[model samples]
Target: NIFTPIEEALEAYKNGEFLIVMDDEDRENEGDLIMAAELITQEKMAFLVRYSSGYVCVPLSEERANQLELPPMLAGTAYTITCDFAEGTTTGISAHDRALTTRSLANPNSKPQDFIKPGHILPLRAVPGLLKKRRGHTEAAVQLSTLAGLQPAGVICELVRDEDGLMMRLDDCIQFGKKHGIKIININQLVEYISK
Candidate 1:
């Protein structure tokens, strides 16, 4: 009989209560694979199609690219790309190739150094070294402490070095500041914080 609710079958599998009993040696060739495929499809599970020998090329549409906010052919845009994996090899087109050249950077290369020094400055910010004051001393301490807590969570924070510039991960810092209603600063204005 066909299973009425597939959840029951899944639960059985999860609890190791389901078993396949094959009495005949020919059972291996007797439609077990097809049965499994039908069950999988009935449960709305996805399956990959394996080809004996061929390449599958799926072109990216403009709508998909725009939805992804793929960087334009300029230095300052960020984009994400999909990759292909097969035969123990991985290859794909970059989401942001128009911004780079063999000799020079694209028009949006405002923060070119960051590419060479990842994790130093915030990638989203055009300028660095500016700081928005925490709403109060207690708030600043709490925000800083929260960042420190990330150390145990495997979230690393480090100083990013770019030529003569050093920047920190603003993403975490900015989020913490926003939570406390504090101002956010960039590298260019960090000196103002120290001077005050």
Candidate 2:
């Protein structure tokens, strides 16, 4: 199959590998590079930055967001306050530092005080119903991570062309996945799997 099976995708995600999730062509028609937040590592973060727009965003469940006291930057959007780990490296922009921020975001013990606002790492509050409620990348990323029995938090970055700052199309995303050995799955597939 051109696309990875949902079960295999879950296994890869649980194993801390990169996953490329493509929304329907009728929708955003873009692909996002996703990884479980708890599984983030410096090396993986570096790779993600290289292929993506580098605006690394962590998608967390609404309840998790509430627990962390992460309100939206405004209203009715996924964008929440940017954050940096309360105790960690400098600037919080480097891959190593960003990795720590993402992993800590998935930690249940992490509190609002554990993070410093107006930092590099961005967190998006995902809808509870996931794809059922929203077909956006924020929901898809969290849903995929949660299905892997993870912390219901995932790091998602939009793939962009290095030469031109345009979102990667499905064909380009598929090629990118093949080149990096990363599994690719469609949101519709996940939706179908969950529906069954």
Candidate 3:
């Protein structure tokens, strides 16, 4: 059978174990010999046959294929991490872990806005007296400066007519991180430091 010749070639390639090609995109137009070798080495057999100028294959072990369910792919623009600290406010937003995830603002040179919008978060560290020592507005400014790397260019710390008060929004925090090339932290993961 045609498979017999392919099987012989596969055995020879396996014994040699050299010159393996890396055509993940499958643009080389070669047979799927590399994938076959991998499946075979794992004690799993695969068969590839050409029909009507196209190749089709199946794994002998359904369990292996089922076990190899692809992982979920994350889709988003890449971001970097930035760390910031507030001047006097500890209760205000702070880098909880000294890490920030931010991207460049749509207008990088644009001044900082008053309220936190989508894509930014404060990083409140677990340091003592940091949050409590500063007033709420001051703490918020400190958090923004630490993460944003500069004091608010405008009245960012002033209480605006927002429902959430001065507390930063998680989405805005993420936006800030993205704008500033900081890595964003999931807000739900933050642990409030408590003393016993």
Candidate 4:
């Protein structure tokens, strides 16, 4: 399900726990590792692909950066610029400002029209100081994180998964979660544990 209550997820994050984020049908559709950005180190922005939530990108405000800010992504030219990750710095701007900032920041050849969004170059971190990854596991991470008032990230993974990967055994998933500091649980168990 796409409804892992953020209340519990956020609680676990504060308690320094990892969540499988997705399982069963959700896992088959969009599975990923979920954790608190505060619990993780070095943040990154992500464009999430989800079934329930749709396409979204959430980055920390202060950590948000512009294209020319790290534009080697300008394709060696300078007509356009857009949002990018990977080599960005903190400087969050709205989708409105996102275009203006890059254009205004032009040298002499940059154009607001050419300034578009970048798929590879990305933000370094979020202004809210949350950490994130491209691939997702569940909406819990973003839902919980945002609900808890971390970053205004969407309640899903940045990237999406399809039905082509092999399913791992539940025990294996458990062991993997344990070894990696992640908590792997199914919908039933998740609700039960969170209800507490």
TM-score, cand. 2 vs. native: 0.94
Candidate with better lDDT, 1 vs 4 = 4
TM-score: which candidate is best? Answer: 2
Per-model TM-score on C-alpha atoms: 0.14, 0.94, 0.17, 0.38
Tens-place lDDT per residue, model 3, 21-134, is 111212221211122212122111111111111111111111211222211122211111211222222332222211111111111232233213222222222222322453
Per-residue CA lDDT of model 1 for 59-175, tens digit only, reads 112332233233333441221232222112222212111112100111122233323311111111111111243322112222221222310000011222233433323443333
Query: Alpha carbon lDDT of residue 25, candidate 4?
Result: 35
lDDT of 1: 0.21
Clashes of each: 17, 0, 48, 25
RMSD of 3: 27.8
- Report how far off residue 112 is in candidate 3 (Å): 27
- Ranking according to TM-score, highest score first: 2, 4, 3, 1
| lDDT by residue (tens digit), candidate 4, 152-181 | 322223222234333334444444456545
Stretch of 10 with least lDDT, candidate 4: 43-52
Q: What does the lDDT come to for candidate 3? A: 0.22
* Model 3 misplacement above 4 A: 1-130, 133-135, 140-168, 183-196
Better of 2 and 4 by TM-score: 2
